[model samples]
Target: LVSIDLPIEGRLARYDLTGRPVPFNSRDAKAFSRVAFAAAHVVADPLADNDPWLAPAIDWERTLAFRHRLWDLGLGVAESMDTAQRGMGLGWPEARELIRRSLAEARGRPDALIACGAGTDHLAPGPDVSIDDILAAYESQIEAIEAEGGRIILMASRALAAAAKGPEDYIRVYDRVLSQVKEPVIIHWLGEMFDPALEGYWGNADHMAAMKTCLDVLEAHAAKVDGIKISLLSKEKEIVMRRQLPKGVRMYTGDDFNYAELIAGDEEGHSDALLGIFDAIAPVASAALEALGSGRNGEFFELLEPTVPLSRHIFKAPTRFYKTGVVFLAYLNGLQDHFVMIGGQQSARSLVHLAELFRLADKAGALADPELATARMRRVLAMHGV
Candidate 1:
């Protein structure tokens, strides 16, 4: 579990409403210290038969409104990253539009923290594109994001992975973009699990070698860079890398499986979070972060440790398909009307896996409304005649 709950009156009422499940309101929910932002997925209009919600025809209002919900709960928005289905169904054109609108909404509220993802998804895989091409792509997006007055997160690119001949290529490409960024930007290093196309990122298949190259990039641009978000999912690697970062650079943990322990950390240090799982567990995540902020680290870890197993299960093999589990949890928790996803991705996972997810969610106290969750889950099971 990425978050926890504060003791708030009437916050749990909707879980049992009319003996049926429904979404809960964020306003009445108890506030937690850590900001938990949901990477908002665009909901497809039911009226449009051919429009894939994840593809392009996004309902901007609903999409932005969900971000608003997270902000109202004092969570920050991580916009346009993989969690929003960048390589899955959302194309660059729609992604740019998503970032633009999210930035606008974030500006209207001072309490809400917002960060946008910038990547080279617009470029198709091709034969040996020049390093200049990669640099140009980064510059184009960086300019647009800065002009819109948004903080930027430079996401690891499949294009770079494809074009890079070695670690030098990574150094050359990122060094150019880092120098040109208008403001400090977070550097994202996504692993092959999220997208196989990103293999050999930072110019090495070996985690340690790649990590060294990543650190070199940060060391070279420490002043210009904000921090790096590492999603390799190995807790040991993240812990090791966290200690090596420059004094000012932050370590935003993206390990879905061991987030609680990874974020909570040991006596030497801890990690700040930048997770896709946090989107589905905002309330609890808020509570846990607050606990950590107050120096109750043990309490915070205790709150989150239980969910690690569930996260590992959801993010297991064919890891790029983890979004299916993320959306599945949302349905069980009463956050969405249905388990349906853009590109018909709801069918991505097996029914058995989903059933296990529900069992784990219940154990984690992630369900805002248990009765409603049970009813909705039963309905899902009924479809499979469980």
Candidate 2:
């Protein structure tokens, strides 16, 4: 049995790892009934000479390899979202390059499902920026993605949020972008918890009111909207919105805390997923989804239920930093060689938090190789002077 001495509640505790890694294998996208997407993370190059905090230095080989891995497991890749540190450190310029590279990679495989994020992140949110300026910014980014034949995940805009006068401004922006897309695109409504700059999105601070505005936009442009993913973290709100989506539009759940139950659905309906947590839990998630597709409800919940707490901890308060935890698991699972991030976000979480994460991941069987994970956990702890 592999074991590690970890700090818990300010004291060192020896914990024995439990469970074997879930048995999930590569499959076609058609293997699962739910349209699932894993918002994949990028791998950072630790030895790059550039300032880690200032500029993104990606390990391109490793980064693209992770996407290949996700596709191999039958999950669509939601590219260049916050999980990749888009606005936080990796700016619009780098984001475009990442999308270009990822689309190239996806083309090599016939079954690889991929969607790229397009937004006005290139434009700074400020007083001088106008609604017209925001509209142009959105156009530029959207055109770039379409130029490469990429499916779009229309990202929430900090610039638009700053410039919009009210709901009418949001309507104008969405209407213009939706009308122009080459294909039906996934709309992303990222919550303030993920990016504070997106607060008052759709011109209202109240999410319910804000949602109504968003729904109206989707209703107006339902033919252009493939679906919408809202990251509000409230299942009740998600269910309410899911039930009301324009008939053809899908609700891809972004709720990391309540994904299992939300995806399982009630008597009314269920959510399709485009979650960040899926990146960290791909193996188990893939197996759970496959089990779900095969009509094994008992087995589906059996595999997925244990993962909720681990996801909650990774996605705990200060949810934006959850990317660090996602990357940390990639490190422990031997998917990446180091726990570094483009924006130096590896330091975003506390040692205590990481220790707890290791514990929880172990319990959840998310540690694909416990021996490797144990060794890595020790290394991280030792580096922290534990």
Candidate 3:
């Protein structure tokens, strides 16, 4: 039967065997589970030394605790990637620390698959850097993750975007980095919508041109690559690129808007996922993926189809700032006690936008604790004398 509604909600909640919130559990260890979702960054502790005036402050303990929640669901953790608000308030030092800590945690439980972001985010944008310089920056982070026994997600680099003279520059840099990787790595191609500074990635602004460069890099390093995580958000583009991937390279869709359909796939092929939306919809995602695992393709799509409207809304215009919606849904769904973000990014959207999110979440049955969510909504509305 096709079930369009989710059976539970309040975001991805973690509980102990006795049904108590243990803050940590065995679920955090499984690696071959259906998907890998990250809770992203907890706003930096206000008492810490960053810009507190930026956005609502984060609750560190709760934030890290949320990662356990995803782990509890047997989902791999794609930690410290862009979803954690990287390149925003999460500076390179903080991101590196996050990767180190998360790596240690994952090691403690061999069952969980954990991959951290490696990039040139630490390098400030300056005069055009040479291809060698970009490769060097990538090498430094790759070395850090390797030393910690962590897997890598080769994150798209803004520095590379600024430095590349053309497609050849990209191929040169990636070819060098891929050759040194000791393990299969996930290649990330974050689109400009997520970060405007990434425009002209692969050394071209045109999508086809950029894709050609990306494809060339993959073809050259196909043996070194495991999969590619693309966040272009254009379903057509993703499908086109996915079809062209060299044999054996998985397409880890980062498209939040049309994930269910993409993952369900057509006669050509389907996408596996490494998405930010999965962070907010873990239980539902798990259930749906389980259906897919059992070859219930129709059932899987039916389960996820309803959430697309909500996903599209959260990831709507000014797409890069979608983290706000991700965390906002987390708060409403009860995964976190507050809606605060690192750097006080809660105010990134207007009240109207939040209202729409609330409505869509409700309709999608994503609010795990509806009573709690309703109470929270009422409190906010009452505060505004609604």
Candidate 4:
């Protein structure tokens, strides 16, 4: 138990955190049977004279090195997704470069399971943006990612939401893009909590109707789609959709909040994972997945269930800012030297929030090197005048 008095809710309180850390080394290298991917975060070049809020100034070496770390831990990397700050700060140009670098790196490791997000992020969303503009933008990104030989994760487009007249518009655009695919690709369905601009994706504000519309598109292009990762954070909805998917269409869980149960799944079937939380819990996730593959369901849940609280905490309200916690854990665990992020988003979460994150991480035993994590956390704490 990590029993420490932390400054929580504006006051110091005694808290007992309970969970056993996964019994695995961060240095272990392997692949998973379940095909898991960690939607990764970019390393910001803290010294660059980049606009803290708009321009992306990434540290290419550390950024790619992080992917190497994920691969070493037996997790595939999900590049250019929201975890990399897609619409939040990272523009399409930078995301494209990231996809290129990641795909190039994967070239040497031909067996590495990887995917890149292709979206209409390049076209800024506005009242005046047209459906044709959304189509063109999605086409450009798809071409670029395909040109790099990276598998595509057809990302939900805010521009489409801004321009699309109805469900037909979504189907029309996806049909055109999927029809040209050189290989099957994953489809992304990010929730509005992650990006408000995607509030009415698939031309419906009602989530069930929206989901149906998305299914219609997927059913039409099932041959070109490998799977769909839904980020609504609702297990009920995910399970419902899981039962209804067309045969051969995989459902990758994007629910950081209830991932343990979702991934554990019912007796009928389980969901594959493409999670943002996986980026923060790679070693633990790798270990848990290993246990699962060995037919050790007990061991799997033991290692992962504890992480649920930490995951839920990091991905709590204003969940879009969860990247702050992900990167902070990276800094604490010595993966990076600083708690910096693209677009100066490190400030998205408050000091109290980070204090809670530290407690949860420590409790979960995810701090691989407890001493180094404690020391680094002290630096963050000191800086916060705590």
Candidate 5:
């Protein structure tokens, strides 16, 4: 009997293992009705002598292997997104290496769907930084990713947000970049909640005004834009934008709060998927998407609905630290050997939060092996003198 005592609401409570894992396995790719991408996280090299805060050390083999796992489940890997700790601890140098290696790995797989984040994370924002400088920064990243033969996800740029005087500046930059792109790219509209530096992105403090500027860019370059992912965490806002999007341009939902209903849209249309929570709940996400593809509507929600609470918990306010939970679950599931994180961010969440996450994950059937999860979780609790 694998049971453990966890701190719950200021009391030590014993949790009995369910021991019945969700039946999710690696399978060949299937042509699902929706386009889904798990914004994957990178595995950190715990043994590296580099300082965790100042230097990033990646476990390349394990990191690539994780993508293989996603591909096996018929999910596209959205490489180098915030879920991978981009801008939080992962700077552009390590992200470039991650993109290069992940692209190479995807090329070897027959059924892999992959996209790389191309943004100006390298360009530090300052008063001296001009709009042209932001353009150059995006151009360099886009050039590097394209050189690696990878598709692009145009990430919202903090540098541009800092430099823009108004919405026209956004239009000018996006137009210039989109015009030069060799292939259609996915536009990423990351909200301020994800990163504070992007608070007035597209030159407007109002999200709707920001959306107008963003829509202008998309409408002008609809052929060059494959889709746009908005991470506002509001389903109503996402639906409004989805309905107004330029013809042939898709809406990839970055809303972790209500992805199930967003993906399963009204008769009018549905948003496709590109989410960070999908990284934590890949097995359930895969199973649910497969069911939806088969028109098993009830089964889709049955598999996915339980995960809403877990996803919301992981993506709680101070949402950037959500990567800590994403990587933690990976550790609990035995995807990685240790609970270490680059930039020492494993310390971002409290043990109490993790205890709750354990309970929620168990309820959601997100834990792959209950016994191993409990055992490993015990080690974390013990290390904390619990």
Candidate 6:
């Protein structure tokens, strides 16, 4: 039922929703057997000038503190990926600094598994740029991560998607870069939903064909490949790719729309996680992983399955701006102090959208401290003069 009246848009409306109480009893979810990582987001320094688009002035303190929070919960951090607004408002200068700082910070901790996203976002791409230029860009990003001794999640390149005339172009680029990698690396295949520029990734608009193209690359350089994370939002495609992976190569699930069952897995094996949803559902995720580790699959499902609705809502169409919701939850949970974004994207969703998110978070029992959450939520409502 609706709980209160909210100024959804131009007028106030009654919202009679009544959410369930905060649900998890256990809090020391520090031990997880799975190789789980949260594709983390960066906090903006709201006080700084929004001089131009994509040139974000970030709050270094609050920014890194989120990583510390993720590590404390026993989850690794996937730094400088799309969740950080990589191509949205964050550019190479910001991303490089984020990676460099994250690498330096992780070094101080005893057990922080960190990976940096290396892509072709450094320079604009078109037919004007040759394959050699794109290859150099990939090499540059790879070299940067290697310099930090950080593991690499070889990000799918928008430039490559634009420049490649066929599957062979992708093969040629990967062949050159994979051959030079100092360590086995994770490959990322971000579908068009998350980024339209990646429509023809792997040189095929047909996802299965695209997957085959990628598999061919992996077969040729299996030694340098660690695993692949596909964010197609399709559980079937993910499972198909999961099963077909070369022996020893892992399948890290990025299906935000359906992650619970994907992580649970079936007869053959399970998919480990490398998801942005984990960034918003940290506590529950930590708890669920701990449960799965102790062979408590039922408990794992019970704790995490309900969160799918919240994830789906956050990652709804125009999914690229999902970072807005991620940061909003952070603010409501006291992770950060302001509800501002790098490119002023905090207003991406309507108050009605957020109202439902609060209710769903409560119903799913994801809000860490209920009293605190309600208070913050009410504050946001009041901020809008509801």
Task: Evaluate all candidate structures by whole-model CA lDDT and list the values in order.
Answer: 0.76, 0.92, 0.75, 0.86, 0.91, 0.85
| Best model number under TM-score | 2
Residue 188 accuracy (lDDT) in model 2: 96
Clashing pairs in 5: none
lDDT of 1 by residue, 37-93 (tens): 445556544445565643546666767877886776566788988888887788888
TM-scores of the candidates are 0.88, 0.99, 0.88, 0.95, 0.98, 0.94
Off by over 4 Å in 6: 1-4, 7-30, 52-54
Task: lDDT winner between 1 and 3, please give it.
Answer: 1
In angstroms, the error of model 2 at 239 is: 0.4
Give the distance in Å from residue 89's predicted Cα in candidate 6 to where it truly belongs. Answer: 0.8
Pitting candidate 2 against candidate 4, the one with the higher lDDT is 2
Instruction: Answer with 3 or 6, whichever has the higher TM-score.
Output: 6
Task: Report the poorest 10 consecutive residues by lDDT, candidate 4.
Answer: 24-33
Better of 1 and 3 by TM-score: 1
Report the error of model 6 at residue 347, Å. 1.0
lDDT of 6 by residue, 296-371 (tens): 9999998888888999999998888889889988887788888888888889998888887877777777777666
Q: Pairing residues by index, what is the TM-score of model 2?
A: 0.99
Task: State how far residue 162 of model 3 sits from its true place (Å).
Answer: 1.3
Candidate 1 backbone collisions, by pair: 1-307, 3-284, 3-285, 4-284, 4-285, 15-369, 36-75
Candidate order (TM-score): 2, 5, 4, 6, 1, 3
- The lDDT, on a scale of 0 to 1, for candidate 3 is 0.75
Query: Rank by lDDT, descending?
Result: 2, 5, 4, 6, 1, 3
